[PDB]
């Protein structure tokens, strides 16, 4: 494991080969989880891009958070999708924490600490454990088929994922930088495999 603290990956030029591969020790399939991350880019006023790509062998889009141009944040699980519309786009680092639970289908979406209304998805579904997680490319196959129009140019960090829903308090602690313990993906014990033009630098965001 390598401590990524106070550091971030940089994707300086749009391309279809620069990507980072993450490795999950996960064994049991997930009924629930909470993804939290911090990303920065100016592409908003331009084509769409993929923030986080989770793909099992039987579905390229098990979980994909995606910014859709003029639309906003697009969350999808198990092949379904819902859109969290955004009226106007600013230009600044943004933190986002999203939860989904298989029992109730409730999805929570916290942007910069401010929660969006809860909605429903795929009640009763289950997520396989054996998967590939990639940063900087939307994969339409298990480990390839990265399209150039969808790659991310910019910065990403603090990537963290649990196997259960955090309470609002815990999310507030995370957004404020307090101590916590990831159990499926730890930024502080991360294990990865870089590919192409990606570098490691100090984080810009506070």
């Amino acid at each position, epitope marked *: 494991q390598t401590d990524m603290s106070r550091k971030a990956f940089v994707f300086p030029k749009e391309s279809d080969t620069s990507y980072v591969s993450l490795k999950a020790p996960l064994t049991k399939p997930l009924k629930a989880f909470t993804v939290c991350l911090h990303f920065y880019t100016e592409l908003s006023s331009t084509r*769409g891009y993929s923030i986080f790509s989770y793909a099992t062998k039987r579905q390229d889009n098990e979980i994909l958070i*995606f910014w*859709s141009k003029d*639309i906003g944040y*697009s969350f*999808t699980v198990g*092949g379904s999708e819902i*859109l969290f519309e955004v009226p106007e786009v600013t230009v600044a680092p943004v933190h986002i924490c999203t939860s989904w639970e298989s029992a109730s289908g409730i999805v929570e979406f916290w942007v910069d600490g401010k929660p969006r209304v809860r909605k429903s998805l795929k009640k009763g579904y289950t997520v396989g454990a054996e998967a590939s997680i990639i940063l900087g490319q939307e994969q339409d196959s298990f480990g390839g088929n990265f399209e150039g129009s969808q790659s991310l140019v910019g910065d990403i960090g603090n990537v963290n994922m649990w196997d259960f829903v955090l309470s609002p308090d815990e999310i507030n602690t995370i957004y404020l930088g307090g101590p916590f313990s990831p159990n499926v993906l730890n930024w502080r014990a991360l294990k990865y495999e870089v590919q192409g033009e990606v570098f490691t630098k100090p984080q810009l965001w506070p």
Partner: nanobody
Amino acid sequence: EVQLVESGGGLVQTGGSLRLSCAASGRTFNRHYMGWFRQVPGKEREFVASISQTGLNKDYVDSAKGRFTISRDNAENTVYLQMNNLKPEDTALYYCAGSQSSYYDKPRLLTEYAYWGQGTLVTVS
């Protein structure tokens, strides 16, 4: 609320290709999912495919997968259905429909759909 029109139909020999297109009149087009349905004389309409609003999630019928492709261009707000290796049975009317001003997954029924186009004819010789 959009108004749907279709084009690209006609007759072709087996093994050909057809890039059918559908145009939408309105400004909320990007807020509606799209779909292609099939109809034959002496029967009702039949699900063919569908396209995501954002344009990242699709759904094909069992016969259409591997042979047909569906895409959408939001800027020009037009839906494209490219079919290849056409078969004689694949000769009927086709309708481009779509109706979820809101946000949800891709269904495969008819009640949810609300708006329909005039239709087009496709024939395989």
